[model samples]
Target: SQAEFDKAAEEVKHLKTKPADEEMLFIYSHYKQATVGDINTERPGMLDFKGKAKWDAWNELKGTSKEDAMKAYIDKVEELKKKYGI
Candidate 1:
Protein backbone atom coordinates (compact mmCIF):
# COMPACT_ATOMS: atom_id res chain seq x y z
CA SER A 1 0.00 0.00 0.00
CA GLN A 2 2.95 2.32 -0.54
CA ALA A 3 1.11 4.10 -3.33
CA GLU A 4 -1.84 4.75 -1.03
CA PHE A 5 0.50 5.91 1.73
CA ASP A 6 2.30 8.25 -0.63
CA LYS A 7 -1.00 9.66 -1.83
CA ALA A 8 -2.09 10.29 1.76
CA ALA A 9 1.19 12.07 2.52
CA GLU A 10 0.67 14.32 -0.48
CA GLU A 11 -2.91 15.05 0.57
CA VAL A 12 -1.74 15.91 4.09
CA LYS A 13 0.75 18.35 2.59
CA HIS A 14 -2.07 20.09 0.74
CA LEU A 15 -4.25 20.20 3.84
CA LYS A 16 -1.58 21.70 6.09
CA THR A 17 -2.55 25.31 5.24
CA LYS A 18 -6.22 24.89 6.14
CA PRO A 19 -7.83 25.86 9.49
CA ALA A 20 -7.28 23.42 12.36
CA ASP A 21 -10.89 22.23 12.44
CA GLU A 22 -11.04 21.80 8.69
CA GLU A 23 -7.72 19.97 8.69
CA MET A 24 -8.88 17.68 11.50
CA LEU A 25 -12.14 16.88 9.71
CA PHE A 26 -10.29 16.33 6.45
CA ILE A 27 -7.72 13.98 7.94
CA TYR A 28 -10.39 12.14 9.94
CA SER A 29 -12.26 11.35 6.72
CA HIS A 30 -9.19 10.83 4.57
CA TYR A 31 -9.13 7.13 3.81
CA LYS A 32 -6.69 5.66 1.35
CA GLN A 33 -9.44 5.03 -1.17
CA ALA A 34 -10.52 8.66 -0.96
CA THR A 35 -7.01 9.85 -1.55
CA VAL A 36 -6.73 7.48 -4.49
CA GLY A 37 -9.99 8.76 -5.92
CA ASP A 38 -8.76 12.34 -5.64
CA ILE A 39 -5.54 11.54 -7.50
CA ASN A 40 -6.89 9.12 -10.10
CA THR A 41 -7.26 10.64 -13.55
CA GLU A 42 -9.50 9.78 -16.45
CA ARG A 43 -7.43 11.13 -19.33
CA PRO A 44 -5.82 10.05 -22.56
CA GLY A 45 -2.35 9.98 -21.08
CA MET A 46 -3.60 7.66 -18.35
CA LEU A 47 -4.67 5.20 -21.01
CA ASP A 48 -1.78 5.76 -23.37
CA PHE A 49 -0.41 2.28 -22.89
CA LYS A 50 -3.63 0.51 -23.79
CA GLY A 51 -1.87 -1.63 -26.37
CA LYS A 52 1.76 -0.84 -25.70
CA ALA A 53 4.46 -3.49 -25.78
CA LYS A 54 5.85 -2.20 -22.52
CA TRP A 55 2.62 -3.04 -20.77
CA ASP A 56 2.51 -6.53 -22.20
CA ALA A 57 6.17 -7.06 -21.49
CA TRP A 58 5.70 -5.99 -17.88
CA ASN A 59 2.79 -8.35 -17.44
CA GLU A 60 4.84 -11.20 -18.83
CA LEU A 61 7.80 -10.34 -16.69
CA LYS A 62 5.62 -10.10 -13.62
CA GLY A 63 4.14 -13.51 -14.30
CA THR A 64 7.59 -15.06 -14.38
CA SER A 65 8.96 -13.29 -11.27
CA LYS A 66 7.12 -10.64 -9.37
CA GLU A 67 10.06 -9.78 -7.12
CA ASP A 68 12.40 -9.26 -10.03
CA ALA A 69 9.86 -7.16 -11.86
CA MET A 70 9.27 -5.07 -8.74
CA LYS A 71 12.98 -4.51 -8.30
CA ALA A 72 13.30 -3.46 -11.90
CA TYR A 73 10.35 -1.16 -11.43
CA ILE A 74 11.97 0.47 -8.42
CA ASP A 75 15.18 0.94 -10.36
CA LYS A 76 13.27 2.46 -13.24
CA VAL A 77 11.58 4.85 -10.82
CA GLU A 78 14.93 5.92 -9.42
CA GLU A 79 16.17 6.52 -12.94
CA LEU A 80 13.05 8.55 -13.70
CA LYS A 81 13.53 10.62 -10.53
CA LYS A 82 16.94 11.65 -11.83
CA LYS A 83 15.66 12.12 -15.35
CA TYR A 84 12.68 14.23 -14.28
CA GLY A 85 14.40 16.09 -11.41
CA ILE A 86 12.06 14.68 -8.83
Candidate 2:
Protein backbone atom coordinates (compact mmCIF):
# COMPACT_ATOMS: atom_id res chain seq x y z
CA SER A 1 0.00 0.00 0.00
CA GLN A 2 2.69 2.42 0.97
CA ALA A 3 4.64 1.31 -2.06
CA GLU A 4 1.87 2.36 -4.42
CA PHE A 5 1.33 5.49 -2.45
CA ASP A 6 5.03 6.34 -2.61
CA LYS A 7 5.10 5.77 -6.34
CA ALA A 8 2.16 8.11 -6.79
CA ALA A 9 3.98 10.73 -4.79
CA GLU A 10 6.99 10.44 -7.01
CA GLU A 11 4.89 10.54 -10.15
CA VAL A 12 3.28 13.81 -9.13
CA LYS A 13 6.71 15.41 -9.04
CA HIS A 14 7.17 14.60 -12.71
CA LEU A 15 3.86 16.03 -13.88
CA LYS A 16 4.35 18.20 -16.99
CA THR A 17 1.48 20.55 -16.25
CA LYS A 18 1.53 22.91 -13.34
CA PRO A 19 -1.48 22.39 -11.10
CA ALA A 20 -3.71 25.10 -9.79
CA ASP A 21 -3.18 26.16 -6.21
CA GLU A 22 -6.41 24.53 -5.15
CA GLU A 23 -5.43 21.26 -6.73
CA MET A 24 -2.06 21.39 -5.06
CA LEU A 25 -3.78 22.04 -1.77
CA PHE A 26 -5.92 18.97 -2.23
CA ILE A 27 -2.82 16.80 -2.65
CA TYR A 28 -1.02 18.49 0.19
CA SER A 29 -3.89 17.80 2.55
CA HIS A 30 -4.15 14.17 1.55
CA TYR A 31 -0.41 13.65 1.81
CA LYS A 32 -0.31 15.17 5.26
CA GLN A 33 -3.26 13.11 6.38
CA ALA A 34 -1.74 9.93 5.06
CA THR A 35 1.65 10.59 6.58
CA VAL A 36 0.60 12.15 9.87
CA GLY A 37 -3.02 10.95 10.35
CA ASP A 38 -4.22 14.31 11.70
CA ILE A 39 -3.14 17.77 12.59
CA ASN A 40 -0.71 17.64 15.47
CA THR A 41 0.36 21.23 15.86
CA GLU A 42 -1.02 24.73 16.10
CA ARG A 43 -2.15 26.63 13.02
CA PRO A 44 0.13 29.24 11.60
CA GLY A 45 -0.64 32.86 12.43
CA MET A 46 -2.66 35.00 10.04
CA LEU A 47 0.40 36.89 8.90
CA ASP A 48 1.80 33.67 7.46
CA PHE A 49 -0.42 33.59 4.38
CA LYS A 50 0.96 30.53 2.65
CA GLY A 51 1.54 28.69 5.89
CA LYS A 52 -1.97 29.40 7.06
CA ALA A 53 -3.42 28.19 3.78
CA LYS A 54 -1.50 24.93 3.91
CA TRP A 55 -2.38 24.45 7.54
CA ASP A 56 -6.03 25.04 6.81
CA ALA A 57 -5.95 22.60 3.92
CA TRP A 58 -4.41 19.88 6.09
CA ASN A 59 -6.74 20.65 8.96
CA GLU A 60 -9.74 19.92 6.79
CA LEU A 61 -8.62 16.30 6.62
CA LYS A 62 -9.02 15.89 10.32
CA GLY A 63 -10.09 12.39 11.39
CA THR A 64 -9.05 10.64 8.18
CA SER A 65 -7.43 7.25 8.68
CA LYS A 66 -3.95 6.90 7.33
CA GLU A 67 -4.89 3.99 5.08
CA ASP A 68 -7.82 5.85 3.61
CA ALA A 69 -5.75 8.95 3.13
CA MET A 70 -3.10 7.00 1.30
CA LYS A 71 -5.68 5.54 -1.02
CA ALA A 72 -7.15 8.96 -1.71
CA TYR A 73 -3.71 10.32 -2.42
CA ILE A 74 -2.97 7.56 -4.90
CA ASP A 75 -6.31 7.88 -6.63
CA LYS A 76 -5.96 11.62 -6.95
CA VAL A 77 -2.56 11.20 -8.50
CA GLU A 78 -3.98 8.76 -11.01
CA GLU A 79 -6.77 11.22 -11.82
CA LEU A 80 -4.26 13.99 -12.29
CA LYS A 81 -2.07 11.85 -14.51
CA LYS A 82 -4.95 11.14 -16.85
CA LYS A 83 -6.26 14.69 -16.79
CA TYR A 84 -2.87 16.24 -17.39
CA GLY A 85 -1.35 13.51 -19.52
CA ILE A 86 1.30 13.16 -16.86
Candidate 3:
Protein backbone atom coordinates (compact mmCIF):
# COMPACT_ATOMS: atom_id res chain seq x y z
CA SER A 1 0.00 0.00 0.00
CA GLN A 2 2.89 2.31 0.73
CA ALA A 3 4.26 1.71 -2.73
CA GLU A 4 0.95 2.52 -4.32
CA PHE A 5 0.69 5.68 -2.23
CA ASP A 6 4.16 6.69 -3.24
CA LYS A 7 3.37 6.13 -6.90
CA ALA A 8 0.24 8.23 -6.65
CA ALA A 9 2.14 10.93 -4.83
CA GLU A 10 4.67 11.04 -7.62
CA GLU A 11 1.95 11.23 -10.20
CA VAL A 12 0.32 14.12 -8.38
CA LYS A 13 3.65 15.89 -8.14
CA HIS A 14 4.17 15.52 -11.85
CA LEU A 15 0.66 16.70 -12.58
CA LYS A 16 1.14 19.80 -10.45
CA THR A 17 3.27 21.44 -13.11
CA LYS A 18 0.35 21.87 -15.45
CA PRO A 19 -1.95 24.85 -15.58
CA ALA A 20 -4.24 24.41 -12.64
CA ASP A 21 -7.42 26.04 -13.96
CA GLU A 22 -7.51 23.79 -17.01
CA GLU A 23 -5.74 20.51 -16.23
CA MET A 24 -6.98 20.12 -12.69
CA LEU A 25 -10.49 19.36 -13.88
CA PHE A 26 -9.24 16.36 -15.80
CA ILE A 27 -7.01 15.39 -12.93
CA TYR A 28 -10.05 15.39 -10.68
CA SER A 29 -11.84 13.15 -13.11
CA HIS A 30 -9.00 10.66 -13.26
CA TYR A 31 -8.24 10.73 -9.55
CA LYS A 32 -11.77 10.52 -8.21
CA GLN A 33 -10.95 7.48 -6.18
CA ALA A 34 -8.11 9.20 -4.36
CA THR A 35 -10.09 12.28 -3.37
CA VAL A 36 -12.01 12.86 -0.20
CA GLY A 37 -15.38 13.86 -1.61
CA ASP A 38 -17.78 13.52 -4.51
CA ILE A 39 -17.36 14.86 -8.03
CA ASN A 40 -19.12 18.10 -7.17
CA THR A 41 -16.99 18.84 -4.19
CA GLU A 42 -16.14 22.57 -4.13
CA ARG A 43 -12.47 21.88 -4.59
CA PRO A 44 -12.87 18.39 -6.03
CA GLY A 45 -9.29 17.32 -6.76
CA MET A 46 -7.89 20.82 -7.05
CA LEU A 47 -4.69 21.89 -5.38
CA ASP A 48 -5.15 24.58 -2.78
CA PHE A 49 -3.01 27.67 -2.84
CA LYS A 50 -3.96 30.45 -0.54
CA GLY A 51 -3.08 33.13 -3.04
CA LYS A 52 -0.82 34.25 -5.81
CA ALA A 53 2.12 34.79 -3.48
CA LYS A 54 2.01 31.25 -2.16
CA TRP A 55 1.58 29.90 -5.64
CA ASP A 56 4.60 31.91 -6.72
CA ALA A 57 6.60 30.48 -3.88
CA TRP A 58 5.66 26.97 -4.91
CA ASN A 59 6.68 27.60 -8.49
CA GLU A 60 9.95 29.04 -7.33
CA LEU A 61 10.59 26.03 -5.14
CA LYS A 62 10.04 23.80 -8.16
CA GLY A 63 12.77 25.68 -10.03
CA THR A 64 10.21 27.01 -12.45
CA SER A 65 10.62 30.57 -13.62
CA LYS A 66 7.72 32.62 -14.89
CA GLU A 67 8.67 31.58 -18.42
CA ASP A 68 9.01 27.95 -17.42
CA ALA A 69 5.67 28.16 -15.64
CA MET A 70 4.00 29.07 -18.88
CA LYS A 71 5.78 26.23 -20.64
CA ALA A 72 4.75 23.77 -17.95
CA TYR A 73 1.18 24.95 -18.22
CA ILE A 74 1.19 24.18 -21.89
CA ASP A 75 2.91 20.87 -21.26
CA LYS A 76 0.11 20.00 -18.84
CA VAL A 77 -2.40 20.36 -21.62
CA GLU A 78 -0.39 17.93 -23.71
CA GLU A 79 0.05 15.56 -20.79
CA LEU A 80 -3.70 15.48 -20.14
CA LYS A 81 -4.35 14.81 -23.80
CA LYS A 82 -2.00 11.84 -23.78
CA LYS A 83 -2.77 10.43 -20.35
CA TYR A 84 -6.56 10.72 -20.37
CA GLY A 85 -7.19 10.32 -24.05
CA ILE A 86 -8.88 13.70 -23.97
Candidate 4:
Protein backbone atom coordinates (compact mmCIF):
# COMPACT_ATOMS: atom_id res chain seq x y z
CA SER A 1 0.00 0.00 0.00
CA GLN A 2 2.84 2.39 0.78
CA ALA A 3 4.42 1.67 -2.56
CA GLU A 4 1.14 2.30 -4.35
CA PHE A 5 0.70 5.50 -2.32
CA ASP A 6 4.13 6.70 -3.36
CA LYS A 7 3.35 6.03 -6.99
CA ALA A 8 0.06 7.90 -6.79
CA ALA A 9 1.85 10.83 -5.15
CA GLU A 10 4.28 10.96 -8.00
CA GLU A 11 1.63 10.48 -10.66
CA VAL A 12 -0.68 13.27 -9.53
CA LYS A 13 1.85 16.04 -10.02
CA HIS A 14 2.34 15.14 -13.67
CA LEU A 15 -1.29 15.00 -14.68
CA LYS A 16 -2.11 16.63 -18.02
CA THR A 17 -4.68 18.93 -16.42
CA LYS A 18 -4.23 20.51 -13.01
CA PRO A 19 -6.86 19.86 -10.42
CA ALA A 20 -9.00 22.67 -8.97
CA ASP A 21 -7.57 24.44 -5.91
CA GLU A 22 -9.97 22.73 -3.54
CA GLU A 23 -9.15 19.35 -4.98
CA MET A 24 -5.48 20.17 -4.73
CA LEU A 25 -6.03 21.02 -1.08
CA PHE A 26 -7.78 17.72 -0.58
CA ILE A 27 -4.77 16.00 -2.08
CA TYR A 28 -2.36 18.00 0.04
CA SER A 29 -4.23 17.29 3.25
CA HIS A 30 -4.41 13.58 2.68
CA TYR A 31 -0.86 13.31 1.46
CA LYS A 32 0.46 15.17 4.47
CA GLN A 33 -1.51 13.12 6.92
CA ALA A 34 -0.51 9.91 5.20
CA THR A 35 3.19 10.61 5.35
CA VAL A 36 3.60 12.90 8.33
CA GLY A 37 0.86 11.70 10.65
CA ASP A 38 -0.56 14.96 12.01
CA ILE A 39 0.13 18.65 11.78
CA ASN A 40 3.31 19.51 13.64
CA THR A 41 4.04 23.15 12.90
CA GLU A 42 2.58 26.54 13.46
CA ARG A 43 -0.06 27.98 11.15
CA PRO A 44 1.03 30.34 8.44
CA GLY A 45 0.52 34.05 8.95
CA MET A 46 -2.78 35.63 7.96
CA LEU A 47 -1.24 37.58 5.09
CA ASP A 48 -0.25 34.33 3.45
CA PHE A 49 -3.65 33.16 2.24
CA LYS A 50 -2.41 30.20 0.23
CA GLY A 51 -0.11 28.98 2.96
CA LYS A 52 -2.77 29.44 5.60
CA ALA A 53 -5.31 27.53 3.55
CA LYS A 54 -2.93 24.64 3.05
CA TRP A 55 -2.10 24.54 6.72
CA ASP A 56 -5.78 24.56 7.56
CA ALA A 57 -6.48 21.78 5.14
CA TRP A 58 -3.78 19.55 6.56
CA ASN A 59 -4.83 20.37 10.09
CA GLU A 60 -8.42 19.33 9.46
CA LEU A 61 -7.50 15.66 9.23
CA LYS A 62 -5.88 15.77 12.65
CA GLY A 63 -6.88 12.35 13.94
CA THR A 64 -7.06 10.36 10.71
CA SER A 65 -5.03 7.17 10.53
CA LYS A 66 -2.10 7.13 8.13
CA GLU A 67 -3.40 4.12 6.20
CA ASP A 68 -6.80 5.72 5.68
CA ALA A 69 -5.24 8.93 4.45
CA MET A 70 -3.07 7.00 2.04
CA LYS A 71 -6.08 5.17 0.67
CA ALA A 72 -8.04 8.39 0.23
CA TYR A 73 -5.16 10.09 -1.57
CA ILE A 74 -4.78 7.18 -3.94
CA ASP A 75 -8.51 7.19 -4.60
CA LYS A 76 -8.50 10.91 -5.34
CA VAL A 77 -5.58 10.62 -7.70
CA GLU A 78 -7.28 7.81 -9.60
CA GLU A 79 -10.46 9.85 -9.82
CA LEU A 80 -8.56 12.86 -11.12
CA LYS A 81 -6.66 10.75 -13.61
CA LYS A 82 -9.91 9.65 -15.20
CA LYS A 83 -11.46 13.12 -15.03
CA TYR A 84 -8.44 14.76 -16.65
CA GLY A 85 -8.10 11.98 -19.23
CA ILE A 86 -4.67 11.02 -18.07
Candidate 5:
Protein backbone atom coordinates (compact mmCIF):
# COMPACT_ATOMS: atom_id res chain seq x y z
CA SER A 1 0.00 0.00 0.00
CA GLN A 2 2.56 2.54 1.09
CA ALA A 3 4.98 1.13 -1.49
CA GLU A 4 2.83 2.55 -4.25
CA PHE A 5 2.63 5.84 -2.37
CA ASP A 6 6.38 5.94 -1.93
CA LYS A 7 6.90 5.08 -5.57
CA ALA A 8 4.64 7.88 -6.66
CA ALA A 9 6.56 10.29 -4.45
CA GLU A 10 9.82 9.18 -5.95
CA GLU A 11 8.53 9.31 -9.52
CA VAL A 12 7.56 12.94 -9.16
CA LYS A 13 11.05 14.05 -8.18
CA HIS A 14 12.97 12.79 -11.21
CA LEU A 15 10.89 14.48 -13.82
CA LYS A 16 13.22 15.56 -16.62
CA THR A 17 11.63 18.96 -16.73
CA LYS A 18 9.96 20.99 -14.05
CA PRO A 19 6.22 21.41 -14.26
CA ALA A 20 4.87 24.92 -14.90
CA ASP A 21 3.99 27.21 -12.00
CA GLU A 22 0.32 26.39 -11.64
CA GLU A 23 1.00 22.74 -12.34
CA MET A 24 3.62 22.77 -9.63
CA LEU A 25 1.04 24.18 -7.27
CA PHE A 26 -1.33 21.38 -8.21
CA ILE A 27 1.36 18.85 -7.52
CA TYR A 28 2.13 20.46 -4.19
CA SER A 29 -1.48 20.57 -3.12
CA HIS A 30 -2.19 16.99 -4.14
CA TYR A 31 0.98 15.72 -2.57
CA LYS A 32 0.21 17.39 0.73
CA GLN A 33 -3.43 16.33 0.65
CA ALA A 34 -2.32 12.74 0.07
CA THR A 35 0.36 12.62 2.73
CA VAL A 36 -1.49 14.44 5.48
CA GLY A 37 -5.18 13.93 4.68
CA ASP A 38 -6.07 17.61 4.98
CA ILE A 39 -4.73 20.94 6.09
CA ASN A 40 -4.17 21.05 9.88
CA THR A 41 -2.11 24.15 10.45
CA GLU A 42 -3.54 27.52 11.27
CA ARG A 43 -4.03 29.64 8.17
CA PRO A 44 -1.23 32.13 7.80
CA GLY A 45 -2.00 35.81 8.25
CA MET A 46 -3.31 37.92 5.39
CA LEU A 47 0.01 39.70 4.97
CA ASP A 48 1.58 36.36 4.20
CA PHE A 49 0.15 36.03 0.74
CA LYS A 50 2.33 33.17 -0.39
CA GLY A 51 1.60 31.14 2.72
CA LYS A 52 -2.09 31.91 2.49
CA ALA A 53 -2.28 30.76 -1.12
CA LYS A 54 -0.57 27.50 -0.29
CA TRP A 55 -2.81 26.89 2.67
CA ASP A 56 -5.83 27.79 0.56
CA ALA A 57 -4.90 25.27 -2.06
CA TRP A 58 -4.70 22.42 0.45
CA ASN A 59 -7.69 23.69 2.34
CA GLU A 60 -9.76 23.51 -0.81
CA LEU A 61 -9.29 19.74 -0.58
CA LYS A 62 -10.52 19.64 3.01
CA GLY A 63 -12.82 16.65 2.69
CA THR A 64 -10.83 14.58 0.20
CA SER A 65 -9.84 11.05 1.20
CA LYS A 66 -6.17 10.22 1.48
CA GLU A 67 -6.51 7.42 -1.06
CA ASP A 68 -8.15 9.66 -3.61
CA ALA A 69 -5.60 12.40 -3.07
CA MET A 70 -2.72 9.99 -3.48
CA LYS A 71 -4.24 8.60 -6.66
CA ALA A 72 -4.64 12.08 -8.05
CA TYR A 73 -0.99 12.94 -7.42
CA ILE A 74 0.12 9.71 -9.06
CA ASP A 75 -2.13 10.26 -12.06
CA LYS A 76 -1.01 13.86 -12.51
CA VAL A 77 2.63 12.88 -12.41
CA GLU A 78 2.03 10.19 -15.02
CA GLU A 79 0.23 12.71 -17.17
CA LEU A 80 3.08 15.18 -16.96
CA LYS A 81 5.66 12.54 -17.68
CA LYS A 82 3.81 11.52 -20.80
CA LYS A 83 3.27 15.09 -21.86
CA TYR A 84 6.98 15.87 -21.63
CA GLY A 85 8.19 12.41 -22.71
CA ILE A 86 10.18 12.47 -19.50
Candidate 6:
Protein backbone atom coordinates (compact mmCIF):
# COMPACT_ATOMS: atom_id res chain seq x y z
CA SER A 1 0.00 0.00 0.00
CA GLN A 2 2.69 2.45 0.98
CA ALA A 3 4.84 1.53 -2.00
CA GLU A 4 2.03 2.14 -4.49
CA PHE A 5 1.12 5.38 -2.81
CA ASP A 6 4.63 6.59 -3.45
CA LYS A 7 4.54 5.31 -7.02
CA ALA A 8 1.30 7.17 -7.65
CA ALA A 9 3.06 10.34 -6.63
CA GLU A 10 5.71 9.88 -9.28
CA GLU A 11 3.08 9.59 -11.99
CA VAL A 12 2.52 13.32 -11.71
CA LYS A 13 5.90 14.15 -13.12
CA HIS A 14 6.18 14.85 -16.84
CA LEU A 15 6.54 11.52 -18.54
CA LYS A 16 9.28 10.49 -20.91
CA THR A 17 6.52 9.88 -23.44
CA LYS A 18 3.45 11.94 -22.96
CA PRO A 19 0.20 10.25 -22.03
CA ALA A 20 -2.73 10.92 -24.29
CA ASP A 21 -5.97 12.26 -22.89
CA GLU A 22 -7.39 8.78 -22.52
CA GLU A 23 -4.46 7.58 -20.45
CA MET A 24 -4.50 10.82 -18.58
CA LEU A 25 -8.11 10.28 -17.56
CA PHE A 26 -7.37 6.69 -16.64
CA ILE A 27 -4.60 8.01 -14.48
CA TYR A 28 -6.97 10.42 -12.85
CA SER A 29 -9.67 7.85 -12.13
CA HIS A 30 -7.30 5.26 -10.80
CA TYR A 31 -5.29 7.73 -8.79
CA LYS A 32 -8.40 8.86 -6.97
CA GLN A 33 -9.47 5.29 -6.44
CA ALA A 34 -6.12 4.33 -5.05
CA THR A 35 -5.81 7.32 -2.79
CA VAL A 36 -9.37 8.02 -1.74
CA GLY A 37 -10.80 4.50 -2.22
CA ASP A 38 -14.22 5.53 -3.57
CA ILE A 39 -16.57 8.27 -4.60
CA ASN A 40 -18.68 8.83 -1.51
CA THR A 41 -19.21 12.58 -1.56
CA GLU A 42 -21.86 14.38 -3.56
CA ARG A 43 -21.00 15.02 -7.17
CA PRO A 44 -20.01 18.57 -7.84
CA GLY A 45 -22.67 20.80 -9.31
CA MET A 46 -22.25 22.37 -12.71
CA LEU A 47 -19.44 24.91 -13.28
CA ASP A 48 -16.94 23.31 -10.91
CA PHE A 49 -14.65 21.96 -13.57
CA LYS A 50 -12.13 19.88 -11.64
CA GLY A 51 -14.61 18.61 -9.11
CA LYS A 52 -16.98 17.29 -11.73
CA ALA A 53 -14.31 15.51 -13.67
CA LYS A 54 -12.69 13.91 -10.62
CA TRP A 55 -15.94 12.86 -8.99
CA ASP A 56 -17.55 11.59 -12.16
CA ALA A 57 -14.56 9.52 -13.15
CA TRP A 58 -14.49 7.68 -9.83
CA ASN A 59 -18.24 7.32 -9.87
CA GLU A 60 -17.97 5.33 -13.08
CA LEU A 61 -15.41 3.00 -11.54
CA LYS A 62 -17.35 2.17 -8.41
CA GLY A 63 -17.74 -1.45 -9.39
CA THR A 64 -14.13 -2.18 -8.61
CA SER A 65 -13.17 -2.85 -4.99
CA LYS A 66 -10.60 -0.69 -3.26
CA GLU A 67 -8.02 -3.47 -3.22
CA ASP A 68 -8.39 -4.00 -6.93
CA ALA A 69 -8.21 -0.29 -7.60
CA MET A 70 -4.96 -0.03 -5.72
CA LYS A 71 -3.39 -2.92 -7.54
CA ALA A 72 -4.65 -1.72 -10.89
CA TYR A 73 -3.22 1.73 -10.32
CA ILE A 74 0.20 0.43 -9.37
CA ASP A 75 0.28 -2.02 -12.26
CA LYS A 76 -0.80 0.58 -14.77
CA VAL A 77 1.83 3.05 -13.68
CA GLU A 78 4.48 0.37 -13.98
CA GLU A 79 3.14 -0.55 -17.41
CA LEU A 80 2.97 3.04 -18.55
CA LYS A 81 6.50 3.78 -17.40
CA LYS A 82 7.77 0.84 -19.37
CA LYS A 83 5.67 1.68 -22.38
CA TYR A 84 6.66 5.30 -22.21
CA GLY A 85 10.35 4.35 -21.75
CA ILE A 86 10.67 5.98 -18.34
lDDT per model vs. reference? 0.34, 0.74, 0.39, 0.79, 0.69, 0.65
RMSD of 5: 3.1
lDDT of 3 by residue, 1-86 (tens): 22233244346446524535435543333333233223333331354653333333333334324333433434444565455432
What residue runs in model 2 are displaced by over 4 Å at the alpha carbon?
A: 45-51
Best by TM-score: 4
Model 3: residues >4 Å from true position, as ranges?
1-9, 14-16, 40-86
C-alpha root-mean-square deviation, candidate 1: 13.9
Locate the minimum summed-lDDT window of 10 residues in model 3: 35-44
The worst-scoring run of ten residues by lDDT in candidate 5 lies at 77-86
Predicted candidate 5 versus true structure: per-residue lDDT over 1-86, tens digit per residue: 37365566676666777666555556667778888767887578667855666677778887688778887877777666675434
Candidate 6 ranges beyond 4 A from true positions: 40-56
TM-score of 1: 0.34
TM-score of 4: 0.80
| Candidates arranged by TM-score, highest first | 4, 2, 5, 6, 1, 3
Candidate 3: C-alpha RMSD after superposition = 14.1
* Among all candidates shown, the one with the greatest lDDT: 4
User: What TM-score goes with each of the models?
Assistant: 0.34, 0.72, 0.27, 0.80, 0.67, 0.60
If both were scored by lDDT, which would come out higher, candidate 5 or candidate 6?
5
Total clashes in model 2, counting residue pairs 3 or more apart in sequence or in different chains: 0
Residue ranges of candidate 1 with Cα displaced over 4 Å: 1-50
* Candidate 3 lDDT score relative to the true structure: 0.39
Ranking the candidates on lDDT from highest down gives 4, 2, 5, 6, 3, 1
Candidate 3 TM-score, true structure as reference: 0.27
- Where does candidate 4 have its weakest 10-residue lDDT segment? 77-86
